[PDB]
Design a protein around this ligand. Structure first.
Ligand code: TVR
Length: 182
C-alpha cells in the first residue's frame, strides 16, 4: 500500500524461505551466503526442510548475550546450492525503538501476509514461554500462532524476527549487524 510495505515486500520476495522442523513451519530470513535465522524454539536439528526440500544443516548456533541469557535467535548455515542476497547493510548496529513497523509472514498457512504493527518499543527483558530472554522488541498488535520467524522491518531496516505474543502484544528478537560479522 505504502513505502513501509514496499520495503517489507522486497525482503520477503528475495530473502525468505519456508522452514519446517519437527516443531512446525516457520518464516525464515536469509541474511547472506547460506546463512539464515529462525526462532530458537523451532529446535533446528541436523536436517531441515527448506521450501519442502530435505536440507542438511551445516551449523546452528542458539545466540545468548554475555550475561548468558537467551536471545531466541538461532543462526543456521544451510547446505543449499544457492546464496541469499546480502542484506546485512539493512541490519541496525544498536538496540533502538522504531516507528511504523511491518511484520511479514510467508508459510503454507499464511502466504503473502503483511501486518502494520505500528510503534516498536525496546522492551528488553521478557519471560518468553518461561525462559528469561533479552533484547525483545514489543508492538501492540494481537499476533497469533503461525507468525514466528515473521520479519519486522521499517523503511530501510530489518530490525527483528517475531518470537511470541500474549494475545494483546507481539514480541520480536532483535537482529543486530554484530550477529553476522564474518
Ligand atoms: C488468517 C487469520 C489471521 N488473522 C489474524 N487475526 C488477528 C490477529 C492476527 C491475525 F493474523 C486474520 C484472519 O482473517 N484470520
Amino acid at each position: 500500500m505504502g513505502p513501509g510495505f514496499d520495503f517489507a515486500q522486497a525482503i520477503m520476495k528475495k530473502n525468505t524461505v519456508i522452514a519446517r522442523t519437527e516443531k512446525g513451519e516457520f518464516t525464515m530470513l536469509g541474511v547472506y551466503d547460506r546463512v539464515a535465522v529462525i526462532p530458537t524454539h523451532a529446535s533446528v536439528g541436523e536436517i531441515i526442510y527448506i521450501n519442502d526440500v530435505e536440507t542438511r544443516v551445516l551449523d546452528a548456533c542458539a545466540l545468548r548475550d554475555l550475561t548468558d541469557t537467551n536471545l531466541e535467535i538461532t543462526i543456521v548455515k544451510l547446505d543449499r546450492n544457492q546464496k541469499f542476497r546480502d542484506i546485512r547493510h539493512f541490519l541496525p548496529r544498536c538496540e533502538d525503538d522504531y516507528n511504523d513497523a511491518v511484520l511479514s509472514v510467508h508459510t503454507s498457512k499464511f502466504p503473502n501476509m503483511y501486518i502494520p504493527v505500528g510503534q516498536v518499543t525496546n522492551y528488553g527483558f521478557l519471560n518468553l514461554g518461561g525462559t528469561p530472554t533479552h533484547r525483545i522488541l514489543m508492538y501492540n498488535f494481537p499476533t497469533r500462532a503461525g507468525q514466528c520467524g515473521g520479519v519486522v522491518t521499517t523503511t530501510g531496516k530489518v530490525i527483528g524476527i517475531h518470537v511470541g505474543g500474549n494475545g494483546a502484544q507481539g514480541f520480536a528478537a532483535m537482529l543486530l549487524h554484530s550477529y553476522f560479522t564474518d
